[PDB]
Amino acid sequence: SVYDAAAQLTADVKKDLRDSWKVIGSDKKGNGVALVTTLFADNQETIGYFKRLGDVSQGMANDKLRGHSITLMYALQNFIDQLDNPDDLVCVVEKFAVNHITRKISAAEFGKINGPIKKVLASKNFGDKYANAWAKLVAVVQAAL
Amino acid sequence: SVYDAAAQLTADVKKDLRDSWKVIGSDKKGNGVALVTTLFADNQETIGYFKRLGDVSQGMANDKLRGHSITLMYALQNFIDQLDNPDDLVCVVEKFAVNHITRKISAAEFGKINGPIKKVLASKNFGDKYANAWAKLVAVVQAAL
Ligand code: HEM
Ligand code: HEM
């Protein structure tokens, strides 16, 4: 369950999430677009869910893609801010899951973001230690899907 | 259309939005819930759109309502951060309007959030000057609905 997954966020895992987000969250537009573009490049099969965004290969030039990428980063900002209170983190995660469930996005499908996240982290000098920490957070969301 | 509304966001308006948000946004859970509950209190009819949240009379204690309230504040955080770049503000506002348009929420209906905002600002001692500034930001969103 999501409640069991949330308990997986140990002291150091939360610390690593904060330290890394401090750098990544500094540039939501740049890192957000890089994250979304990397997802479409590594998993072209997911592009079907974003028909509304149009020509996704335009990247930063695509207004809809840029709007989505920036907004996405604020959802991560939300999760990071709720790390202190497990009860709040959970209600925020379930709230976030509603729309993804409606779009029939499965836990396995959502888990494809781990690759893009690991690469963005690496580009900022954050290794496996941090990629694994973020996979833990992503796992909390997967448990709600 | 959204661009024209964004033009009303003058240097002074953006200054007041940033100063008031520095306080309001410091407690997203507390002020977020205050906003939503005040909306339901002053405009009971808007409750028809939130059947999913369950017993909204529980307020803060309601996990779904608390989860929604907190998340709502991050949309505002998003807008406030994009104030200096009209292009990003516009793409983020249009991205935000997509789901509200699907819910059949007209600009008039959305405008009902102005009252609650004015009251929340007043509780922190922010006069009409700030209430008008925020009414202009909401106007940008209304232009997208
Ligand atoms: C780090 C992970 C992710 C985050 C933080 C995230 C965040 C968001 C946010 C904040 C929205 C806007 C609110 C909403 O409508 O739900 C959204 C929309 C959406 N998400 Fe997710 N999402 C993530 C991963 C994914 C993945 C992996 C898929 C699909 C493979 C997906 C598909 C969608 C779609 C289709 C939309 C609508 C896009 C549009 O039409 O503008 N999301 N997501
Ligand atoms: C400053 C005002 C508002 C902000 C910043 C805001 C923000 C948000 C956000 C971030 C979401 C989650 C993403 C999504 O599903 O779109 C959302 C959901 C929603 N909003 Fe808005 N909203 C505002 C006002 C309103 C108003 C006035 C109504 C209707 C009278 C409305 C109705 C909804 C509904 C029904 C949901 C889904 C709630 C749920 O089932 O969890 N919103 N809004």
Curated annotation (Swiss-Prot), chains A, B:
Belongs to the globin family. Pfam families: Globin (PF00042). GO terms for molecular function: heme binding; identical protein binding; metal ion binding; oxygen binding; oxygen carrier activity. Residues 8-145 form the Globin domain. PROSITE patterns: GLOBIN. Heme b binds at H100. The keyword Metal-binding applies. The keyword Cytoplasm applies. This is Globin-1. Keywords: Cytoplasm, Heme, Iron, Metal-binding, Oxygen transport, Transport. It comes from the Eukaryota. It is found in: Cytoplasm. Homodimer. One of its GO terms (cellular component) is cytoplasm. SUPFAM superfamilies: Globin-like. InterPro entries: Globin (IPR000971), Globin-like_OT (IPR050532), Globin-like_sf (IPR009050), Globin/Proto (IPR012292), Mb-like_M (IPR044399).
